[PDB]
């Protein structure tokens, strides 16, 4: 039924209704970083994504 | 008229290797702890010819 790879974690699963292998890929990647050139300089900030 | 011959002891050649569960494994070496048959073990041979 299920399927795990070398990382010892479930990566593919068999559909128990239509018989089809589906790969699981969560949408949790990267974060949010702040870039500030200086408080006394200006007040413009930058957002960075990983 | 059932001349039952005495049982004999023989040796196996790697038998009793089944899947541990319903989990698909590929390119990964995993070790389980179930009930298997030891390799090069001594079993009993019964005839019926």
User: In chain A, which residues have their Cβ closer than 8 Å to the Cβ of B26?
Assistant: 5
Query: What experimental approach yielded this model?
Result: cryo-EM
User: In chain A, which residues have their Cβ closer than 8 Å to the Cβ of B28?
Assistant: 4-6, 8
Residue A50: helix, strand or coil by DSSP?
coil
Residue B21: helix, strand or coil by DSSP?
coil
- Residue A9: burial class (beta carbons within 10 Å; 0-12, 13-18, 19+): exposed
Report H helices in chain B. Answer: none
The CA distance from A41 to A35, in Å, is: 13
Is there a contact between B28 and A1 if contact means CB atoms under 8 Å apart?
no
The CA distance from B30 to A38, in Å, is: 53
Query: Judging by DSSP bridges, how do beta strands B8-11 and A10-14 pair with one another?
Result: unpaired
């Amino acid at each position: 039924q299920f399927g795990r790879d070398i990382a010892d974690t479930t990566d593919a699963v068999r559909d128990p209704q239509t018989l089809e292998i589906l790969d699981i890929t969560p949408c949790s990647f990267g974060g949010v970083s702040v870039i500030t050139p200086g408080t006394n300089t200006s007040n413009q900030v930058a957002v960075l994504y990983q | 008229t059932r001349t039952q011959l005495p049982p004999a002891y023989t040796n196996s050649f790697t038998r009793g290797v089944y899947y541990p569960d319903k989990v698909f494994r590929s390119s990964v070496l995993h070790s389980t702890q179930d009930l298997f048959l030891p390799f090069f073990s001594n079993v009993t041979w019964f005839h019926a010819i």
